[PDB]
Amino acid sequence: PVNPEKLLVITVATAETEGYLRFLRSAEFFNYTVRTLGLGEEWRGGDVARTVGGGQKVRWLKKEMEKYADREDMIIMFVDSYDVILAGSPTELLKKFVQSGSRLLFSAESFCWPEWGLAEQYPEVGTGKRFLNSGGFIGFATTIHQIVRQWKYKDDDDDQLFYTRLYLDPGLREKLSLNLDHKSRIFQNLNGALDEVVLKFDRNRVRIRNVAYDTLPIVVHGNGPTKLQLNYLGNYVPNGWTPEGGCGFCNQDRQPPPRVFLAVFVEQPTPFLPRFLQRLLLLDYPPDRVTLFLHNNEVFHEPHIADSWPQLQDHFSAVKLVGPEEALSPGEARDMAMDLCRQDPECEFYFSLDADAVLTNLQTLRILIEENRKVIAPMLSRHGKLWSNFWGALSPDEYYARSEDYVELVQRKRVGVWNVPYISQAYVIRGDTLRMELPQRDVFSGSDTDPDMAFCKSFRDKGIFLHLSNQHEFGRLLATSRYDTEHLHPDLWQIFDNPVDWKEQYIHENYSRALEGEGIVEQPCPDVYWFPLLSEQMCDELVAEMEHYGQWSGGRHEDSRLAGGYENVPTVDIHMKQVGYEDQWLQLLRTYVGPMTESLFPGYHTKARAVMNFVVRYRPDEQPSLRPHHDSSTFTLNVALNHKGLDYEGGGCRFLRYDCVISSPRKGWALLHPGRLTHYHEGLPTTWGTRYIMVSFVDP
Amino acid sequence: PVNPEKLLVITVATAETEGYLRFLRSAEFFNYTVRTLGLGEEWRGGDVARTVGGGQKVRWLKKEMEKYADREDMIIMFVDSYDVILAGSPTELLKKFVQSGSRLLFSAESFCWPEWGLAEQYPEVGTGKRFLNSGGFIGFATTIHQIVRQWKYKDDDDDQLFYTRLYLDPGLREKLSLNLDHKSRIFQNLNGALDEVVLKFDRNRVRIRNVAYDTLPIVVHGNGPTKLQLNYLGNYVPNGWTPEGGCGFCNQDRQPPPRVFLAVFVEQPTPFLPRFLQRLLLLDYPPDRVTLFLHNNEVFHEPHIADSWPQLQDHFSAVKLVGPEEALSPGEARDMAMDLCRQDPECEFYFSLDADAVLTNLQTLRILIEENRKVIAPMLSRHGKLWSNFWGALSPDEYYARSEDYVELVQRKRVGVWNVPYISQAYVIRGDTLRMELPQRDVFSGSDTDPDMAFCKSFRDKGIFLHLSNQHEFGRLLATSRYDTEHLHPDLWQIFDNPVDWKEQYIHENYSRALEGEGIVEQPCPDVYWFPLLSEQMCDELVAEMEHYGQWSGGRHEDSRLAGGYENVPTVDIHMKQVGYEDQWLQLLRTYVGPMTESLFPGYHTKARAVMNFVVRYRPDEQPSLRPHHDSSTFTLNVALNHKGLDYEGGGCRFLRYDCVISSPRKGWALLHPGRLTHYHEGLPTTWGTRYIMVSFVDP
Ligand SMILES: *[C@@H]1O[C@H](CO)[C@@H](O[C@@H]2O[C@H](CO)[C@@H](O)[C@H](O)[C@H]2NC(C)=O)[C@H](O)[C@H]1NC(C)=O
Ligand SMILES: *[C@@H]1O[C@H](CO)[C@@H](O[C@@H]2O[C@H](CO)[C@@H](O)[C@H](O)[C@H]2NC(C)=O)[C@H](O)[C@H]1NC(C)=O
Ligand SMILES: O=c1ccn([C@@H]2O[C@H](COP(=O)(O)OP(=O)(O)O)[C@@H](O)[C@H]2O)c(=O)[nH]1
Ligand SMILES: O=c1ccn([C@@H]2O[C@H](COP(=O)(O)OP(=O)(O)O)[C@@H](O)[C@H]2O)c(=O)[nH]1
Ligand SMILES: *[C@@H]1O[C@H](CO)[C@@H](O)[C@H](O)[C@H]1NC(C)=O
Ligand SMILES: *[C@@H]1O[C@H](CO)[C@@H](O)[C@H](O)[C@H]1NC(C)=O
Ligand SMILES: O=C(O)CCC(=O)C(=O)O
Ligand SMILES: O=C(O)CCC(=O)C(=O)O
Ligand SMILES: [Fe+2]
Ligand SMILES: [Fe+2]
Ligand SMILES: [Fe+2]
Ligand SMILES: [Fe+2]
Ligand SMILES: [Hg+2]
Ligand SMILES: [Hg+2]
Ligand SMILES: [Hg+2]
Ligand SMILES: [Hg+2]
Ligand SMILES: [Hg+2]
Ligand SMILES: [Hg+2]
Ligand SMILES: [Mn+2]
Ligand SMILES: [Mn+2]
């Protein structure tokens, strides 16, 4: 048994990037002892992500190996740091190195890089990996010193080509006992073997398994175009996320705060924008520390922004609006907003937030700042769907692709802070990162690609982690696909696409509590029920939408009412079918009226069928009342739409068979009474002003 | 001005028949002085109604004229008595006789009788009647004596031929100044001038007018085949019936009573016969003075007669039944019943009463006896139609014909006791008339004609008046046209043909009082109404008609009920459509349920549409209860059909939304509740016996 204290891990890292700090955490988890070479110098190895290079690593290693040139007692493993995570203990590592019977064991991959012509000089291996990879090797300190001493080349010369030619020496291969980890018992290179690697979970740690050779490797190396696939594995291995302990680096359980530059973007006609602008005042963060930027590209929202701006300017420390007259594209506006924080040393954090993002958690800004990340984003999903503000993986064309754990994250099966290749809609960026690591202005613009895809690619090219947190419920995304903007109040027609937001704005706030009972629903007349249904904003926008139509009912209008022996009981009304709002009102009946009816009438079941839906107008100048009659319906929904006293003086409904009078109608409330036989109801006269009501004859 | 005291009316009458007593009343009305010849002797004039004769009249007249042979001061008018009524005063009579300038004025007719060949010897008249009629003449006593003295012929020789030949003497016509009343200024002969005579009404008397000559005759003579047409006029002229004083001889305003022979005839399957037999016990007349005869020709009524016979035999003085086994035709049975009174000197009055006659007036037998007629009949009309138990006139074939005043009598515009040519169904005949005037037994039988037509013709041939009284409301006639006798209770199907009798037998006795309000209808549950609808006999015969069908509902029977979200709420029931009683029950809903619904639910209007009508059976052995559900109807009719306690132990209906229970159903009563939404009703379990209910789902 080789003593673990005789093991030394040597790596090269010119800066403490996120990939390096991720490597060190996996090393400190297994109690490895790591010596890092080159933390202060600059990288002279060229552009190793693009072409050949990395000779500066061997030069620093040769200088380091001169102290251990005669140390036969020391085992030394050299691995990369930016794209390597450790999945195994030193004891298992040394045990597997002894079983190999090699004095210097290199890693093996599927490609002969960089010179493909040397593929013949390699020995024939049956089913394992054939060629050498310099990204990770382990061996005796003396045998390594006899190899790394021969390096006398430029800093920008390929390091793997140097180790390959020394391995391809048949004599030197036999003398020093050089071998390649063919079946990935210690080193796992991902390039060319992506389908071979899967995760293997345990109670409090995670490893990887090579299903092609049935091995549990120790070193996971994301060489080449597999850096994203390693970020996926790095979210778990070794203790990134565990089934019993949860994630390992997130905050989980949670005097001036940092100054923030909030940047709102309205790049398309967005529903419920006045609700979004009113929510900016409610974010739980000291507003005197927030500087607001807002870019509105739509002229449809200029009145919305103007109504909210006096409150925004008085709330935040500073505000600035860039309206549609500047003719700014989405890429140019996001560059400008981000650069305003970059060029200000007082901007400690940058918070971009699109208009279609609804922040239900008012502490979102704090939560993301406490996570202490460079780029972190809150998880926002479309209500009841898998669509969300992040991607789990990329296609070969760097477009969308579903990751193996994408659904587990959206459904919040596994919770934590995840390294993901794409974020959007909302994210918090550290101010230092914008000045030190992405100082250029062309972050979103520059190339013919989506400004949002270029923003994420600009951070991946610099080795920045795009974090995504689903540790808490942050909010949801709106549906802006087909937003019909040609209405006096287009948010009324948003009951299908955004029902959760439609309910908060239009349905009465006490409706849901009334549906659960507890003494809200009243019974003013024997079989007439009274419950709150619509909000004051719903009543106002519906009345205004009717008057904006203008063409009310006059002579020769027939409503399905019953008086005496004829159906000649008219009203001055407008049907929902005339304004193109029939399907939208039927959906209100199915979702909110139907369930309320079956609760108040035990045994009755509705599908909320209704062919007669209309708004009645009562005025002393034209039809101020309605003579007694029956309704052609099983039950009738009678909803007021304005105030008694402020808008009209006059009675409401009167049921003759009971001598019961509804003399004081409530604005947002609704009446639910049977239409036939027992409820001969009469409309009391309106003496002053105008009285509006919404009425549907349900289940005829 | 000739003194009226010098006028003498001489007539011939061998017996005080009804036609003679009618003549004397018209004569005593105008204060005429009449001398009647031959009241004691027998008629030797032959058969004047068939052929020629009447010479015995001239012989008695010649003997009478010998005292007034020299009386120039005396005017004398000779007329018949059986077929003559006086319409004018003596003053008007003498005045018109003076204006004629004749010493002996004969009556004129349209036919030369008996010898038609003598029509040429008559003088030419332009437009009036040409030939002589011996039925009535007026002249001086001396001139008449010089004519009647020449009579020296047999008693059976024609009298008109004698007066005609004396008139056809041109010399004697000029000497004695003989003339004919051509234009009917005094004498009106009806034969050959029927269309010329109409009635002329006044305040307190009636006359006749000859519209062909515009005259008001004094003597109305029904010569030849016009005796019935005179009976019509005799009902008014002169004071028979007046528009201001009503009829003149009827009783109008009303110690042992006479003994009566009551004869009931059942010659066809008649509805409501048990009701008729129970009514015979209720006739207001001392039953110890009534002898009952009953002829039943239908075996269908043998059980009906047998059930009532113990009560009939114990009620009347004597009873006798002649059932269907005797094989008696209707003519033979009516001859036998009438002859049983004829051959009994203790039978003072004979009362025939058919089965289809419903006597609503319990004092009918008294009323007709107080009228003191030979043959009188109470007026009975089909309900709401003109069909009744009498004819107003006859056709030339002695079949039915409508008289001029037939509709005024049926509708009781004119009321009184009327001389009509035909009666049926019910009539009272004096016992003396059967012994003295119609002693033969073949009254109804004998000739190939209807036994009812031969009965009336047998009385007209003897000069008997067939009286008909509509002075009071006596009753009605049943409809026995198409009586479907193939049912366990055929009177259930009699709601269309005899609705007034159907209502008294089957509809609850307190239904009509409840329909007028006044605290009979109850409201046990908020919108559930409780009123009496059916009688105990209706419930019993309907249940028995269901069990007589036998095929109740078991598995896979679906009634239009609503529970949860399916219509799978069955019952053990039988629909009215299965027993051929759907149309009959729909008529009950329209006539009796509908009006009750519109009274209890002000504003609702029904036509009593119902596709689901059925009788439910609840038993502990099969389906003792019914789980909560709704009904596919606007309102539901729930009628009990038996007694709680005597037939079943178990609850009734339960409405869950009100916690109201109908624990004690009433047999003939009905429940009226809405079917949808508010009345989730549940059928309580039947613990013992059997529970029947009738239920209709009205207005679906
Ligand atoms: C919904 O219900 C709540 C409580 O039932 C209402 O809150 C009350 O509102 C009245 C008038 O605005 C106040 O006088 C009370 O003090 C409130 N109660 C509480 C506990 O705050 C609320 O107004 C209802 N919503 C609407 C739209 O009427
Ligand atoms: C119809 O109503 C009358 C009166 O409302 C009922 O007559 C009463 O009947 C009860 C029980 O039979 C007697 O105790 C009372 O004395 C009766 N009242 C009178 C004034 O006679 C009659 O019973 C009802 N008919 C039915 C079929 O129930
Ligand atoms: O600017 C640099 C670039 C490279 N490296 C080190 O050189 C190694 C080679 O980089 P890379 O993993 O991208 O090469 P590959 O494994 O893809 O061949 C990295 O792991 C780093 O440890 C460094 O320290 N600074
Ligand atoms: O049995 C008789 C038949 C005849 N007459 C009298 O004779 C008259 C002639 O009868 P009738 O009127 O029927 O003859 P017609 O007028 O039809 O020629 C009657 O009016 C009676 O007054 C009579 O007294 N007894
Ligand atoms: C690492 O070493 C520490 C001693 O400082 C020890 O407490 C811990 O259990 C070790 N962990 C592993 C995984 O060896
Ligand atoms: C008939 O004579 C009586 C006298 O007894 C007289 O009272 C009556 O008015 C007279 N009637 C007529 C109609 O002449
Ligand atoms: O004004 C009212 O409440 C009665 C109007 C009504 O119910 C109807 O529209 O039929
Ligand atoms: O027994 C009852 O009264 C309930 C039965 C009923 O209402 C039905 O037939 O649906
Ligand atoms: Fe309308
Ligand atoms: Fe209404
Ligand atoms: Fe049924
Ligand atoms: Fe029912
Ligand atoms: Hg190579
Ligand atoms: Hg993006
Ligand atoms: Hg109202
Ligand atoms: Hg003649
Ligand atoms: Hg008859
Ligand atoms: Hg009941
Ligand atoms: Mn690498
Ligand atoms: Mn005559």
To test the contact with chain B by mutation, choose from A609, A632, A678, A680 the residue with the greatest count of B C-beta atoms within 10 A, namely A678
Tell me the torsion sign for CA atoms A232, A234, A235, A241.
positive
Q: Do A656 and B629 touch (CB under 8 A)?
A: no
- Per the CB < 8 A criterion, the answer to whether B682 and B552 are in contact is no
Tell me the torsion sign for CA atoms B451, B452, B455, B457.
negative
Helix (H) or strand (E) holding A201: strand A197-201
Tokens at A226, concatenated:
């597999």
Q: CA nearest A677 in B: which residue? A: B604
Pocket test for ligand 7, best of A681, A687, A690 (most atoms within 8 A of CB): A681
Shortest-distance ligand to the CA of residue A28: 5
Dist CA B409 CA B426 (whole Å): 17
Question: Which residues of chain A lie closer than 8 angstroms to B676, CB-CB?
Answer: 604, 634, 674, 676
Helix (H) or strand (E) holding A393: strand A393-394
CA atoms within 13 A on the CB side of B198: 10
CA atoms within 13 A on the CB side of B59: 16
- Per the CB < 8 A criterion, the answer to whether B38 and B247 are in contact is no
Torsion of CA B433, B434, B438, B443, to 10 degrees: 140
Whole-angstrom CA distances from B416 to B240, B350, B410, B475, B565 are 9, 22, 11, 16, 70
CB within 6 Å of ligand 8 — which residues?
B 561, 571, 616, 626, 631, 638, 652-653, 681, 683, 693, 695
In the chain, the amino acid numbered A410 is V
Q: Do B676 and A604 touch (CB under 8 A)?
A: yes
Question: Which residues of chain A lie closer than 8 angstroms to B630, CB-CB?
Answer: 603-604
d(CA B608, nearest CA chain A) in Å: 13
Dist CA A15 CA A41 (whole Å): 9
Whole-angstrom CA distances from A421 to A49, A74, B584 are 17, 40, 82
* SS3 category, B468: strand
- Per the CB < 8 A criterion, the answer to whether B11 and B80 are in contact is yes
CB-based contact, A682 to chain B, within 8 Å: no
Whole-angstrom CA distances from B339 to A142, A330, B288, B425 are 160, 125, 21, 18
Residue whose Cα lies nearest atom 8 of ligand 7: it is: A695
- Per the CB < 8 A criterion, the answer to whether A507 and A534 are in contact is yes
* SS3 category, B498: coil
CB within 6 Å of ligand 5 — which residues?
A 30-31
Preceding omega of B114 cis (within 30 degrees of 0): yes
Return phi, psi of residue A204, to 5°: -135, 20
Residues after which chain B is broken (C–N above 2.5 A) are: 254
Question: Which residues of chain B lie closer than 8 angstroms to A635, CB-CB?
Answer: 677
Dist CA B580 CA B551 (whole Å): 14
Binding-site residue numbers of B for 2-oxoglutarate are 561, 618, 638, 691
The total of other beta-carbon atoms located within 10 Å of residue B190's CB is 22
Experimental method: X-ray
Tokens at B208, concatenated:
């006749």
- Per the CB < 8 A criterion, the answer to whether A195 and A213 are in contact is no
The bridge status of strand B635-640 relative to strand B648-650 is unpaired
Query: Which bin fits B44, alpha (ψ -120 to 50), beta or left (φ > 0)?
Result: alpha
Helices B451-460 and B330-342, packing angle to 10 deg: 40
* Selection from A399, A382, A388, A357 nearest residue A271 by Cα: A357
- Per the CB < 8 A criterion, the answer to whether B613 and B681 are in contact is no
Q: Do B680 and A602 touch (CB under 8 A)?
A: yes
3-state secondary structure string across A413-465 = CCCCEEECCEECCEEEEEHHHHHHCCCCCCCCCCCCCCHHHHHHHHHHCCCCC
DSSP state at residue B668: T
Tokens at A514, concatenated:
């009334």
Dist CA B546 CA B616 (whole Å): 10
Dist CA B653 CA B641 (whole Å): 14
In the chain, the amino acid numbered A537 is Q
The total of other beta-carbon atoms located within 10 Å of residue A204's CB is 11
d(CA A653, nearest CA chain B) in Å: 16
- Measured in whole angstroms, the distance separating CA B689 from the mean position of its chain's CA atoms is 50
Dist CA A221 CA A188 (whole Å): 6
Torsion of CA A223, A225, A231, A233, to 10 degrees: -70
Residue whose Cα lies nearest atom 16 of ligand 4: it is: B223
Tokens at B188, concatenated:
């009106």
The bridge status of strand A390-391 relative to strand A422-423 is antiparallel
Dist CA B428 CA B389 (whole Å): 13
* SS3 category, B589: helix
CB within 6 Å of ligand 6 — which residues?
B 30-31
Residues composing chain B = 700
Shortest-distance ligand to the CA of residue B571: 11
The total of other beta-carbon atoms located within 10 Å of residue B271's CB is 24
Dist CA A88 CA A9 (whole Å): 13
**Residue B339 burial by Cβ neighbours in a 10 Å radius (0-12, 13-18, 19+):** middle
* Selection from B514, B531, B573 nearest residue B671 by Cα: B531
Return phi, psi of residue A80, to 5°: -70, 170
CB within 6 Å of ligand 2 — which residues?
B 509-510
Could you list the beta-strand ranges (E) of A74-122: 75-79, 84-86, 104-109
Out of A526, A634, A656, the one facing B526 most closely (by C-beta) is A526
* SS3 category, B368: helix
Tokens at A186, concatenated:
């210690």
Q: Do B656 and A563 touch (CB under 8 A)?
A: no
* Selection from B27, B45, B324, B319 nearest residue B158 by Cα: B45
DSSP state at residue B299: G
d(CA A699, nearest CA chain B) in Å: 11
**Cβ partners under 8 Å of residue A74, min gap 6:** A6, A7, A8, A68, A140, A141
In the chain, the amino acid numbered A666 is R
Tell me the torsion sign for CA atoms A165, A170, A176, A179.
positive
* SS3 category, B101: coil
Tokens at B518, concatenated:
């006044």
Q: Do B680 and A604 touch (CB under 8 A)?
A: yes
**Cβ partners under 8 Å of residue B616, min gap 6:** B571, B572, B573, B626, B692, B693, B695
Pocket test for ligand 1, best of A504, A507, A509 (most atoms within 8 A of CB): A509
In the chain, the amino acid numbered B486 is E
Tokens at B132, concatenated:
């002589």
* Selection from B539, B488, B491 nearest residue B693 by Cα: B539
Asked whether A191 lines ligand 3 (CB < 6 A), one says: no
Distance A165 CA to ligand 19 centre (A): 20
Tokens at A218, concatenated:
């120790």
Q: Which stretches of A101-214 are DSSP H helices?
A: 141-148, 159-167, 170-175
Helices A536-549 and A499-506, packing angle to 10 deg: 90
Asked whether B158 lines ligand 4 (CB < 6 A), one says: no
DSSP state at residue A522: E
**Cβ partners under 8 Å of residue B205, min gap 6:** B238, B239, B242
Dist CA B78 CA B135 (whole Å): 8
Dist CA A87 CA A237 (whole Å): 6
* Selection from A278, A427, A292 nearest residue A367 by Cα: A427
Return phi, psi of residue B696, to 5°: -130, 135
**Cβ partners under 8 Å of residue A166, min gap 6:** A147, A150, A172, A178
- Measured in whole angstroms, the distance separating CA B549 from the mean position of its chain's CA atoms is 40
Determine whether the annotation assigns residue A14 to a binding site. yes
Tokens at B497, concatenated:
């043909």
Binding-site residue numbers of B for Fe cation are 629, 631, 681
Tokens at A85, concatenated:
């995570």
Out of B635, B656, B680, the one facing A677 most closely (by C-beta) is B635
* Selection from B179, B201, B1 nearest residue B92 by Cα: B1
Dist CA B208 CA B217 (whole Å): 7
Tell me the torsion sign for CA atoms B410, B414, B419, B421.
negative
Residues composing chain A = 700
The bridge status of strand B197-201 relative to strand B393-394 is unpaired
- Which residue carries 């022979």 as its tokens? B261
In the chain, the amino acid numbered A135 is G
d(CA A598, nearest CA chain B) in Å: 9
Tokens at B216, concatenated:
């008001």
- Per the CB < 8 A criterion, the answer to whether B293 and B341 are in contact is no
Query: Which bin fits B493, alpha (ψ -120 to 50), beta or left (φ > 0)?
Result: alpha
* SS3 category, B456: helix
- Per the CB < 8 A criterion, the answer to whether B215 and B96 are in contact is no
Tokens at A196, concatenated:
């071979």
- Which residue carries 């009469």 as its tokens? A682
* Selection from B205, B203, B268 nearest residue B238 by Cα: B205
Q: Which stretches of B437-535 are DSSP H helices?
A: 451-460, 499-506, 511-515
The bridge status of strand B7-12 relative to strand B660-662 is unpaired
The total of other beta-carbon atoms located within 10 Å of residue B635's CB is 28
**Cβ partners under 8 Å of residue B634, min gap 6:** A676, A677, B674, B675, B676, B698, B699, B700
- Which residue carries 């080193």 as its tokens? A187
DSSP state at residue B680: -
d(CA B586, nearest CA chain A) in Å: 20
Dist CA A81 CA A590 (whole Å): 59
* Selection from A143, A133, A130 nearest residue A107 by Cα: A133
- Per the CB < 8 A criterion, the answer to whether A689 and A617 are in contact is no
DSSP state at residue B122: S
Tell me the torsion sign for CA atoms B128, B132, B134, B140.
positive
Degrees to nearest 5, angle at CA B505 with B503 and B509 = 75
DSSP state at residue A120: T
- Per the CB < 8 A criterion, the answer to whether B87 and B198 are in contact is no
Degrees to nearest 5, angle at CA A657 with A656 and A663 = 40
* SS3 category, A616: strand
Could you list the beta-strand ranges (E) of B577-656: 610-618, 626-631, 635-640, 648-650, 653-655
The total of other beta-carbon atoms located within 10 Å of residue A489's CB is 16
Dist CA B316 CA B312 (whole Å): 6
DSSP state at residue B449: S
Return phi, psi of residue B469, to 5°: -110, 125
- Which residue carries 């009347």 as its tokens? B316
Atom of ligand 6 nearest to the CA of B29: 13
d(CA B562, nearest CA chain A) in Å: 8
**Cβ partners under 8 Å of residue B437, min gap 6:** B374, B462, B464
Dist CA A319 CA A290 (whole Å): 9
Pocket test for ligand 5, best of A31, A32, A33, A91 (most atoms within 8 A of CB): A31
Residue whose Cα lies nearest atom 1 of ligand 5: it is: A31
Tokens at A584, concatenated:
């939208």
DSSP state at residue B301: G
Dist CA A251 CA A366 (whole Å): 12
Out of A564, A604, A629, the one facing B630 most closely (by C-beta) is A604
Dist CA B429 CA B342 (whole Å): 10
**Cβ partners under 8 Å of residue B120, min gap 6:** none
- Per the CB < 8 A criterion, the answer to whether B25 and B19 are in contact is no
What residues pair up with B36 in beta bridges, in sequence order? B11
- Per the CB < 8 A criterion, the answer to whether B525 and B660 are in contact is yes
Return phi, psi of residue A440, to 5°: -75, 155
**Cβ partners under 8 Å of residue A145, min gap 6:** A65, A66, A68, A69
Torsion of CA B85, B88, B90, B96, to 10 degrees: -120
Query: Which bin fits B564, alpha (ψ -120 to 50), beta or left (φ > 0)?
Result: left
Out of B602, B635, B677, the one facing A601 most closely (by C-beta) is B677
- Per the CB < 8 A criterion, the answer to whether B93 and B77 are in contact is yes
Pocket test for ligand 8, best of B525, B561, B681, B691 (most atoms within 8 A of CB): B681
CB-based contact, A601 to chain B, within 8 Å: yes
Q: Do B563 and A674 touch (CB under 8 A)?
A: no
CB-based contact, A598 to chain B, within 8 Å: no
In this complex, how many residue pairs, one in chain A and one in chain B, have their CB atoms less than 8 Å apart? 65
**Cβ partners under 8 Å of residue A402, min gap 6:** A392, A393
CB-based contact, B527 to chain A, within 8 Å: yes
For chain A, positions 617-646, list CB contacts with chain B under 8 A.
Answer: 628-630, 634-635
Tokens at A239, concatenated:
């203790």
* SS3 category, A42: coil
